[PDB]
Amino acid sequence: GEFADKLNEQKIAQLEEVKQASIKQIQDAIDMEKSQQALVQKRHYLFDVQRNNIAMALEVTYRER
Amino acid sequence: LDPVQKFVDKIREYRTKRQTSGGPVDAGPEYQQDLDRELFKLKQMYGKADMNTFPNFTFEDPKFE
């Protein structure tokens, strides 16, 4: 009788870790993708701020002259 | 006011002054001194350049903070 219960509870326990892993991994495929998307567009802006800053600073300078 | 009118006497003296061409009438060395003094304050106000001349320009490089 017990033969089943231990095995069964074993068998469930498994798919319980299986569903778990599975969520946790796909959440990670997810994070990775956000990391990427960010490094994409995202990062250029830093340099864009910088280039913009220059452009302005020359204009102000020209005008001031 | 009627006697008060008799302006005449002032004009005449205006007239003899105005009729005089040889600098400012009855010089007195002070005139130049005062002149020079005020001529100096204006230098202070307007700057140490030759106001008879068109200005030089060397422009500042831009500045970044």
In angstroms, the Cα distances linking A62 to A53, A65, B60 are: 14, 5, 10
Q: Measured in Å, how far apart are chain B's first and last C-alpha atoms?
A: 77
> Between chains, do B64 and A57 touch, taking CB under 8 Å as contact?
yes
Is residue B37 within 8 angstroms of chain A, CB to CB?
no
| Cβ within 8 Å of residue B17, ≥6 positions away | B25
CB contact under 8 A, A65 and B63: no
Question: Angle at CA B34, nearest 5°, toward B28 and B39?
Answer: 135
Q: Which residue of A has its CA nearest to B59?
A: A65
CA A27 to CA B50: how far, in whole Å?
A: 77
| Torsion (CA) B26, B32, B37, B38 in degrees, nearest 10 | 60
CA distance A46 to chain B (A): 16
DSSP B53: S
Residues of chain B with C-beta less than 8 angstroms from the C-beta of A61: 59-60, 62
A60, B61 Cβ separation under 8 angstroms: no
Measured between beta carbons, the chain A residues lying within 8 angstroms of B63 are 57
Residues whose CB falls within 8 Å of the CB of residue A58, separated by 6 or more in sequence, listed in order? B62
Query: How many whole angstroms separate alpha carbon A13 and alpha carbon A63?
Result: 74
Q: How far is CA A45 from the centre of its chain?
A: 18
- How big is the CA angle at A44 (ends A38 and A49), to the nearest 5 degrees? 125
What is the experimental resolution, given in Å to one decimal place? 37.0
Cβ A61–B62 below 8 Å, yes or no? yes
HSE at residue A4, side-chain half, CA atoms within 13 A, is 1
* Rg (chain B; Cα; Å): 24
Residue B49: which residues within 8 A CB-CB, separation 6 or more? B55
